[PDB]
Symmetry: T
Subunit: 163 residues, 12 copies
C-alpha cells in the first residue's frame, strides 16, 4: 500500500513544517525572563525539526511519490492551532509547545502502527521523528514540572499568576 | 520613521520565507536531466535564503518591532506565484526561479532607497539580500544564457521544445 | 534462529559489495553529458554503501557468525547482473542502477520480515540499508521522472532516442 | 575630510572599549536567577564588541591616522556612565545595558550620516557596528518586553519589585 | 502502559551505568600483555555505553517519568556481578566482559519484545543499545575465538593455562 | 610515603565519581524555571568532573597503586549526602551543589597540604581539582548571591519562599 | 645545467598561469545546460592548477633562479590560444580545455625527459603537474567520450549539432 | 544604467587581477632582511585580493553582464605600472605596493560615488574592496611610518640609503 | 606505448582491489590475542589501499583507457591466492599478508621499470603504490621479526607452535 | 585569609588588563622595520594575557569575592607607566614591553609566596601567569640580546642609534 | 639563584631529548607480538616528551639563560644508558623504558625540591614533566604487572622465558 | 642491492636528525632583529625535516633493514659542523643554515642517482627530501639575496658589517 505510507509521511511533513515556522517565530519574538533561554532552545528544536523534515520528504520520494511542502499546504492541511503574532511571552511559548509537541507526538505514534506492517522502514523513520518530538515535549514540560519541594506553577514568569 | 523600516523588513522576510519553501520544494521534486544539478544548487540557495531570513527578522527585533514569519502570513502577504505541486521538471524549475529571483530582487532594490535616508543600517542589510538574490537569479539564468556559438534554447531539457 | 539472521545478513552484504564495485566502476568510466554529475553522485552512493557494508558484516560477527566478503563470494552468490565493461554511457548508468537499486531494495524489504520476529535488532539494521538503497533508487530514477510539462524520455542523453 | 572620519572612528572605538570592559565586568560579577544566562550572553556580546573594536581601530590606521585605545582615553573620553562595582544583580545588568546599548547605537547612527558623503567605506563599517549594538540592545530589552499576556515587569528578578 | 516502558528503560539504564563504571575500572587497572590494547578498547566501549546511557535516561524523561541513575540504585538494582578490585589481568578482563556483555544483551533483547507493541519508539532505542552491547560482546569474544588453525585458548595471556 | 598519596588520590576520586553521578542525575531530572539553564550547566560540570576523575585515577596508577572506582566503593566510601530521587526542583539542585561543591573543595584543600611535601606533583593535580570544584561552587552560589539592589532570596524559583 | 631546469620550470609556470586565468574566466561566464556543472568543475581545476603554479615557482627559487609570473609574461610567452571573451557556451568550454589540457600535458611530458638526468627532483615535480593536467584533460574529454550504446556527439549541448 | 556599474565593476576586477599577479610575483622573488615577513604578508594580501576578485566578477554576472578576466585584458586595460622582474628587494616591494594600493584605493573610492545612486548593492561591494585595499596600503605604509622617536627612513633595508 | 601503461596500471588495480577485499575480510574475522591489533591495522591498510586503487584507475582514464574494476575481473585476473573463509587466526592473517604484500610489491617493482621510459608520470604513481605496499609488508613482517634477545617465533599466537 | 588572596588576584588582574590595552595599542600603531613582526607577536601576547585575565577574575569569584576589572580601576590602581599615544616605533615598543613584562613578572613572583601557604591553588594560577609573562619578556628581550658575533644594539631599528 | 634553575632545567631537557630519540628509535625498530602496540604507544610518548622538551627550553630562555639541546650535549651530559641498535624485541623495549622512565622521574622529583623555594614557576613545570614521565612509566610497567590471577611474567613475549 | 639503499637512506636520516636538533637549537636561542622571524621559520623547517625523518626511517624498515637514529649515531656519523652553543645571532643563523641546507641537498642529490636504478621508490623519497631541503636553503638564502636596487649585504643585522 503506497497510499498508506504517503498519508503517514505527508501528514508528518506538514506538521514538521508547521512546527518549523512556529519554533522560529517564537525564537525571534519570545519575551520575558526566559526569553534568551527559550531563544536558544527553540533554535535547537528548529534544527532538529528541519533535519527530520528533510528526511520525511526524502522518504516520500524514495517510495516513489511526490512531496508537498508548499506554504499553502501548511495552511491548508493545518489541523493544529497557529502561534499568535506579535511579541510572545515566555510562559505563553512554554505552554504552546508543551501541547503542540504532545499533539504531534501522539499523531506520529498512531501513524507508526498504521504503516509498520506494509512499510517498516518508513515506520522506523516515523519512530525517530516521534522520539525527537516527545523529547522536545519534555524540554518544554520540564519548565512547569511539579517537584516534592516546589509545584513549579510558573507564577514567576506569568505576572504572579499560575500558568 | 520606524513604520517605513518595518514595511521594508517585513515584506522582504515574507518573500524570503516564500522562496525558502519554494526552493526546498523544487529541491525534493525536481526531475529530468538536470534534477541532481538543481537538487544541489537549490539546497545552497535555500541555505543562503534561510540565513538572510534570520538576519531580516533579527533586524526587525533590533529596531524594536515584532517579526511575523507565520505560515498564514506567507500565504496572506503573498504577491508572488506559488510553485506547482507534484513532480517538477528541471526546465520548469529553471524558468520559475529565473523570474522569481528577478522579481524579488527588483522589489528589494526599491526598498533600499525607501529606507536609505532614515535607516542606512537596515538598507545595508537589504543590499546584502539583493546581492544574494540577484546572484541566485544569475545562477538560474545561466542555464539558458545565449552565447555566440549556441543560443541555449533549452530544447534538450524540455522534450525538444525551446524553453 | 541464528541461521535465519545469517542468511539475511550475508545475502545483504554480498549485494552491497556488488553495488560497491559497480558504483565505483561506473564512477570511473561514465561518459556523456551527465558523466561528471554521475561521477560525483556515484561516489556518494559508494560511501553510503560501503558504510552499511561494514555495519552488516559487523552485525554478522556480533550475532556470533563469520562474515564472507571475499571476491569469489561476490561472483558466486551473484544473483544480480554484472555492470558492462569499457566506457559506460550516462544514460546506460542511470538505467542500470535504477533497476539494480530497486531489485536490491525489494530483496532487503523481504529479509526484514524474515528476521523481524527472531532478531529485531538485525531487522532494524536491514531497514536502514533498505532506506539508503531506496533513496539511491530515487536519485537514479529522478533523471527520467515524468512531469506534467515534460515526460523526460532522456533523448538528450541517449543520442536522440528515448531511454 | 580626514578629521571627520577620525572623529567618528575614534569616538566609536572608545565606546566599544568601554562596553568591552563593562560587558566583561558584568560577565564575572552578575548574580541572581539570570546570572548564568547573562554570563553566557555577555560573553557573546564581548566577543562581538571586541571584534568590531579591532575593525574600527584598523580602519583608523587604514585612513592614515593613529588609534588611541589606551586605558586613560577610555576614562577621559567617557561620556557614558560607569558600571557599578561589586556583585551585580541580573535585573541591574539588564537595565544597565538596555540603556547603554541604546545610547551607543544612537550616537553611531548620527556618525554614519556625518561621514557618509566623505567616507562611505567608513560609514559602511559604522553601520555594521550600529547593527550589532542595536541587536545587543534588543537582546537586553527582550527580558522586560511587554506582551499581551504578560507585561514582564521583572518582579521575579528584582525582589518582587518592578524593574 | 507507561509502567512497562519505564521498567525496560530504567533496568537498561542501571545496567549501562554498571558497565560504565566497570569498563572504566578495567580501563585503568588492566595488566598483562594486552593491557594497552584493552585500555584503548575499554575506553571506546565506555564512550559508546555512556552515550546510550544518556539516550536511555533522556527517553525516560521523554515518556514522562523520572530517571534514577544514582549510585545507590546501581548497587541496589544490581543483578550483575561486580568487577574485582585491584590490578586486573587482561585475560580476566576479557572473560569478565565476554559474559557481562552477553548477559546484558540477552536481557535487552527480551525488553524489546516487552515494549514493542506499546512503545515502538522506545523499543527502537533498546534495539540500538542491544546492537552496541552485542558488538562489544564480539569484540571481547574474538580474543578467544577458535579458528581452524588455532583454538586460541588464551594460554599466552594466562600464565600458560587455558582461559 | 606512597600510602599518603593513595589516600588523598583515592578519596578525591570517589568524591568526583559521586559528583559525576549526581550532576548527571540532576542534569536529567531538574525542573522549574531554571531547569534548562541548570541542564546545560550541569552537563559542563559533569564533563569537567569526569575529566579530572580520569586524571586522578591515572595519577593513582602512575605512583604505582591500583584505582578503585567501582560502584560499591562510591556507596561505601560515601561521606557525602545522596542526591534525592524523582523530579528535582531547580532551587533544590542549586542548594544541593552549593554545599556539595564547597564540602568537596574544602576536603581537597586539606589533602593538598597532606601530600605537598612528599608528592608535589600529586598535590599539583589536587590543586587543579580544587580549582574546578571551587569554580563550580561559585557557579551554583551566584544564583542566590546577594547584591546591593537585590538580596536574591530565590523566592521566584521556590514557590514564593526564600531558598 | 641550471638553464635547462629554469626553461622547463618557467615554461610550465606560464602555461599554468594561463590556464589559471582561463579556467576562472570560463568559471564565471560559462552558459548552457552544463554551466553549473562546469562552474564547479572549473573551480576545482583552478585550485589544483594554482597550487602547482605555486610549487613550480617555488622550485624555481629553490634551484636559485628568479620566477617570472607577471601578466606581461603570460601574454608574451603565450604559445597557447586565448579563451574567447563574453558569454561562453558549455560545449565551447568543454572543447577548449579538452585541447588545451592535452597540449599542455604533452609539453610537460617532453620537459620531464629534458631535465630527468640533470634535475630528477624538478622532473618529479613536472611529473606531478603532468598528472593533474592529464587528469583534467580526461575530465573534459569524458563529456564527449564515445560509448557502445551512445557516441556522445554533444548535440544536446550544442543546439542540435555535433560538437 | 547597466553600463555604469559594468564600468566600475570591470575596471576594479582588472586592477584586482593585476595586484593578484603582482603580490604573488613579489611573494616569490622578494629578498633582503624583510623577505620572509613580506613573503607571508603578500600571501595574505593575495588571498584577500583573490576573494574580492571573485566577488567582483560574480557581481558582474549578477547584474547581467559578462566578466572579462583574461590575461590580455589585464595587460590591455592596464593603467598601472608593472612590477619589475627578477629578484626584488624588500624596500622596493614595500614602496611599490604603498603607491599601488593607494592608487587603486583612490580609484575605487571614485567608482563608489559613480554607482551609489543607480546600484547601491554594487557600491556596497566596491566599498568592501576599498576597505581591504586601503588596509593593505596601511600594512605596507607602516614599514616606513614616521614616529616621534624614529623617522623610519628605511636605511637598514636599503643599503644605508633612505627609501 | 599506451598498451604498456594500461597493462601495468590495470594489473596493479586488480591486485589492489584483491587486497582491498582481503584486508577487509581479515579485518572482520580475525581472531586470537592480536585480533584487535590487526583489526585496527588492517583497516588502516584498507584505507591506504583503497586510496591508491582510486588513483590507479584515475590514471587509467587520464591516459585515455577504460578501467576494469569489476568483481569478475578480480576473480579472473587473480594470480594471487584467496584468503580463507570463516574465522581467521591472528597468526594466519600475519603470515598471509606478509607474503601477499611482498608478492604484490615485487610485481609493482617490475612494472615501474617497464613504463619508466614511456610513461614516467605513471611510473611515479606505481612507485608510490610500491612504497605503501612494502610499508604494509614491514608492518606485517615485524610481528615475527627476529631480534638478538628473541627470535619471535610466534609460538604465543599459534597454540605453542612456531609460525 | 581571604583578603590576602584577593589582594594578589585583584592586583594581578589589573596589571593584566593594563597589558591587555597596551599590547593591543602597540599592535595597531607600531611602525618601522619590525612593525608587522611585532603586530603579529603583540596579538599573540594579547590573546595569552586576555585568557589569563579571565582565569584570574574567575578565581576571584571562585574564592568568594567580587572582581573589579572596570576602566577606572585600571587607571586608578595603575602603578605602571602608560604606553605613549600616536604612532609607536618598533624599537620603542620592544623596549617598553621588555621592562613592562619584567616588572609585572617580578610582582607576580612575590605574590606567589604571599599566598602559597594559605591558597596553594591560587598560587598555582599565579605561577602560570608568571610563566606566560616571563615568556613574553624573553620574546621582547631577544630582539636586543647580545651574542658572541653581534651585540645587537638595535641601531638598524632606531635611526642608527643604539637602543 | 639563576644557576640552580638552569641546572634543573638543562638537566631535564637533555634527559627529555635522550628519551625523544630513544622512544622514536624503538618506535621504528620494535619487533614481536607487541610491536605494533608499542609502535603506537611510543609515538604518543614521543609527542608528549617533545612537547615538554619545548616547554623546558622555553622556560630556560624565559629565566634569561641559553638552552643547550645540541646532539653533542645529549651524548655528553648522558648519565643514562643508550638504547641498543638493530631490531629491538618488544619485551626488551618494555623493560628498557620501564627503568628509563622511572630513573628520569626520580631525578625530576629531586629537582622540584631543589628549585621550589627560589623558582616555584619552574618547579611547577618540572612537576608537570614528572607527571607525564611517571605516567609513561606506568604504561610500560603495566605490561608485566602482577595480578591475583596471573603474575604476568612476560613469557609469551620473551621466547618462553620470564622477562 | 639492499646495502646501497640502506647507505643512502641511513646517511640521509642522520643528516635530517642533525638538522632536526640544529633548527630547534637555533629556534630557541636566536637573537637580534630577525630573531622572531627565524624563530617561526625554523619551527616550520623543523616540522618538515621531522616528517621526512620519519619517512626515511620508515622506508628503511620497508626495505627490510634496521634504522639507526640514536644520539650517538648523530654525533658519530656527523660529517657536518655542529651549531654553536649559547645565544645565536640572527645573521649567524642565516649563514649557518644557508650552507648546511646546501651541503645536505647536494649529498642527497648524489644519493638519488646512486639508487635510482636499483630502488626507484627510495630514490623517489630522496627526491622529495632534496626538494624540501633545497626549498629551505632558498628561504635562508633570500635574506641576503642581491637585487638590482640593493645588494643586501646584511649590514643591518650584523652590527654594521657585511655578512
Ligand atoms: Ca524498528
Ligand atoms: Ca534507527
Ligand atoms: Ca513572562
Ligand atoms: Ca552602504
Ligand atoms: Ca556590508
Ligand atoms: Ca526536462
Ligand atoms: Ca549519453
Ligand atoms: Ca535579582
Ligand atoms: Ca595475563
Ligand atoms: Ca522551582
Ligand atoms: Ca550549449
Ligand atoms: Ca634590502
Ligand atoms: Ca592465534
Ligand atoms: Ca624604528
Ligand atoms: Ca605548584
Ligand atoms: Ca599546572
Ligand atoms: Ca618478543
Ligand atoms: Ca621519479
Ligand atoms: Ca611523488
Ligand atoms: Ca644581529
Ligand atoms: Fe535534501
Ligand atoms: Fe536567530
Ligand atoms: Fe569495521
Ligand atoms: Fe588587529
Ligand atoms: Fe543529556
Ligand atoms: Fe584514561
Ligand atoms: Fe608560496
Ligand atoms: Fe566563483
Ligand atoms: Fe574517484
Ligand atoms: Fe569567563
Ligand atoms: Fe618553541
Ligand atoms: Fe612513524
Amino acid at each position: 500500500d503506497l497510499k498508506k505510507s504517503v498519508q503517514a509521511l505527508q501528514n508528518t511533513l506538514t506538521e514538521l513544517q508547521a512546527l518549523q515556522l512556529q519554533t522560529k517565530q517564537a525564537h525571534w519574538n519570545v519575551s520575558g525572563t526566559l526569553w534568551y533561554t527559550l531563544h536558544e532552545l527553540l533554535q535547537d528544536h528548529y534544527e532538529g525539526i528541519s533535519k527530520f523534515a528533510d528526511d520525511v520528504a526524502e522518504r516520500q520520494l524514495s517510495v516513489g511519490a511526490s512531496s508537498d511542502g508548499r506554504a499553502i499546504t501548511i495552511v491548508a492541511a493545518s489541523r493544529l492551532p497557529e502561534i499568535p503574532g506579535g511579541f510572545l511571552d515566555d510562559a505563553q511559548v512554554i505552554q504552546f509547545f508543551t501541547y503542540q509537541y504532545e499533539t504531534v507526538g501522539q499523531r506520529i505514534h498512531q501513524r507508526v502502527g498504521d504503516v509498520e506492517k506494509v512499510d517498516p522502514t518508513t515506520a522506523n523513520l516515523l519512530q525517530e521523528v516521534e522520539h525527537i518530538i516527545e523529547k522536545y515535549q519534555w524540554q518544554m514540560r520540564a519548565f512547569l514540572q511539579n517537584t516534592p519541594t516546589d509545584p513549579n506553577t510558573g507564577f514567576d514568569i506569568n505576572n504572579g499568576k499560575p500558568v
